[PDB]
Design a protein around this ligand. Sequence first.
Ligand SMILES: O=C(O)CNC(=O)C(=O)O
Ligand SMILES: [Mg+2]
Ligand code: NI
Ligand SMILES: [Zn+2]
Length: 331
Amino acid sequence: AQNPNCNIMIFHPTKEEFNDFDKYIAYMESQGAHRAGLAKIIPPKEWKARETYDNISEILIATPLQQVASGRAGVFTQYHKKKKAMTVGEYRHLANSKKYQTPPHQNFEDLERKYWKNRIYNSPIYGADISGSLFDENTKQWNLGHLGTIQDLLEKECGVVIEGVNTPYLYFGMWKTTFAWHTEDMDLYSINYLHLGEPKTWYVVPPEHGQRLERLARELFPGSSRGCGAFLRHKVALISPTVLKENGIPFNRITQEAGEFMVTFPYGYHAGFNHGFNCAEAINFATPRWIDYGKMASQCSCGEARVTFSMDAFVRILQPERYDLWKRGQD
Ligand SMILES: O=C(O)CNC(=O)C(=O)O
Ligand SMILES: [Mg+2]
Ligand code: NI
Ligand SMILES: [Zn+2]
């Protein structure tokens, strides 16, 4: 078995190898990459997502989110308070203000220490989940707006044609902006490209050990656990590496820099934070190997998780017994 310790693997495809996206995913899996839950892909040196980022300041962040924490430094939840709209140029200035800027630090490890020590005492503002793309239309390789759609994958594998579309999302971050512990909707893959700015640190649990994280989360968030049988689908809970190590949960960490891709694999729990002002683009995708994970994916039916139009068909076809109850949650 390849990669039996479930380490995060880093790949350096040549420009020739960067042509065929599906084939490269299947190659990474042949080397065991999926066992970690997360992989890094450094694009060939000839490749570019677009020519420059010089003209992005007029993109609108219609609903910036202020991420307010409750709990203790290593075990907390966050809620998102909606703020007034602002442009990316306004948000960048805010991120660089004395109130919100990255503190002085020695290296990524010192910054990580400061994040875990101090995150809860601040409320950074995140421009998340903005439909759109920063890939130039002429970029032919690994263009996250030109991938094969999950609806077409389901149709190719299972023969059933379904409604729904699959488009990317932009994320504008600042120091301490946080993504809570989660897997993707329907335990899909994700791919994330860091277009510009400061790094993003990731934490991940191997898929084969995801239920260990879930059991710890039920112990640490006991009221949330009683409220919903899949409350990590709310995307609000944080647990530090120190707490994970104290409780024997297997995980790995890695920092993504501008110009790098990350891939998350089905049922790979992940969480992380941004080091300073940045912009990422991400989208879900599927392969044949995903279908069995989609069939088994947990669902939130309490009503909190509230997700896309396109998830309907996935539940209806892959999880017909759950369909009924899950849709009660969504309406
Ligand atoms: O970048 C972020 O805030 C969160 N992204 C992801 O969870 C992802 O790409 O799967
Ligand atoms: Mg603009
Ligand atoms: Ni994710
Ligand atoms: Zn729920």
